[PDB]
């Protein structure tokens, strides 16, 4: 059915393929929804988010504000692009949500709709292969008061391989600064610019977890129940191997 | 600093 | 709020060398008063098995067999109060029948959320900045996965520290053996027991979805729709330390 | 084999 990347017991995904893959970034600043504000600081996650990937092999294309069918049709493409010689797939949402809901630049769609297509029957060529997923938006409007602390062949699920990471705990805002960008995505470049090429995924993404929970907390003097507040990201991982990007 |  | 610093700021890993490990309760169901649900037969080998390997970790654990959901629901807010302070960790498991944001108790259902909500830090400072772990055996739903063959001092998020681990991926069936219990569990707690002392938590857990992944495949010869179906857990994390538990 |  699909070709095998790697040998059915090895402990790390083959990274070792001709391209690293591509990098997909949906970067939403701007809305035509009118309750939307813009998004300021979105565009310095953007291109530091973009850079990081590229020193780490990607292929990265950003799309600036796209409408929701705009986004699903180059993600249907995408998913219909042969694979066969890449190590894996990032798609990177930056944009605004609520629970289960991202925005397009015109209207809203379910976050399921960026990994749907990538499934191993869909696309058998990223089969067995990682399938990378970024998300910086809100997931609801709870706010985290933060606490101090003192003193020959083998078959596989078409469902595995998806990483996906989001920004937030479901049901919560998520924290972005006019002018570092977001919280998770500087927290995210900065751990994948120190050790990308070195430390496996899930425990890169422990300590982007923990930079974002111990030195981010909120300041909005003009409204208290905005103000110091905390946040902490949500790992979502099926990963049947361990993810070591290594140098091209 | 805002939300998303 | 104010709690107890249990490891220092910057630290590498949870600080696992408490006087405790820390509580284990597991909530196991085998038997239901909705009509509907048949018995889950294997789930005791789930839970003996389980309960056995988490005792060699150190976890003082208790087994609590078929209760109403408003008795899950009690000792669950009694362990909340009870004071975690020389203890490692938390780890809660449930073991029963589910649907998509939903898990079974023996006379109804109540929402999964339920089973971590209590323990967020400002309700259980007393697990400030420790792990907490939940393990869930039960489908999110029913749709199946056919699979495919490859050929050829300082302040934290109160809701930071959850790791939360399913069998299965949302909206998907979960399986279960009536005679060897759950894939879930038989993986996690063979990963367990050959290396629950060494690996961290998210390296171990990536091992138990490999074994999930790649050992098992259902057999249903009189359904084929139900036939060689495939699985693959899914791993939710808010850590913000590496997990090994040593000792 | 069953499902849960």
Redesign the interface.
């Known amino acids: 059915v699909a070709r095998m990347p790697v040998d059915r017991n090895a402990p790390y995904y083959n990274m070792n393929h001709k391209h690293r893959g591509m990098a997909i970034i949906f970067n939403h600043e701007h809305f035509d929804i009118h309750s939307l ?1 813009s ?3 979105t565009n310095v996650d953007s291109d530091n988010l973009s850079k990081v990937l590229k020193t780490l092999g990607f292929k990265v294309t950003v799309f600036p504000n796209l409408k929701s069918e705009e986004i699903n049709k180059f993600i249907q493409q995408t998913a219909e692009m042969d694979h066969s010689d890449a190590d894996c797939l990032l798609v990177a949402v930056l ?3 609520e629970l289960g809901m991202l925005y397009a630049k015109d209207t809203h769609y379910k976050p399921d709709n960026l990994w749907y297509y990538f499934t191993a029957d869909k696309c058998p060529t990223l089969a067995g292969k990682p399938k990378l997923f970024f998300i ?3 997931q609801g ?1 709870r706010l985290d008061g933060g606490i101090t602390l003192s003193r020959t062949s083998y078959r596989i699920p078409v469902h595995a391989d998806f990483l996906i990471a989001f ?1 937030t705990v479901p049901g919560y ?6 002018t570092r960008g ?1 919280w998770f995505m500087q927290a995210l470049c900065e751990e994948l610019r120190y050790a990308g090429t070195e430390r496996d995924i899930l425990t890169l993404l422990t300590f982007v977890c923990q930079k974002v929970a111990l030195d981010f907390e ?3 003097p003009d409204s208290a129940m ?1 103000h110091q507040q905390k946040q902490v990201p949500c790992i979502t991982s099926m990963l049947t191997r361990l993810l070591v990007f290594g140098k091209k | ?4």
């Open positions: 504000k998004r300021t600081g944009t605004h949500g910086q938006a809100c409007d920004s805002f998520s924290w972005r600064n006019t977001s909120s300041n909005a905005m | 600093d805002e939300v998303d």
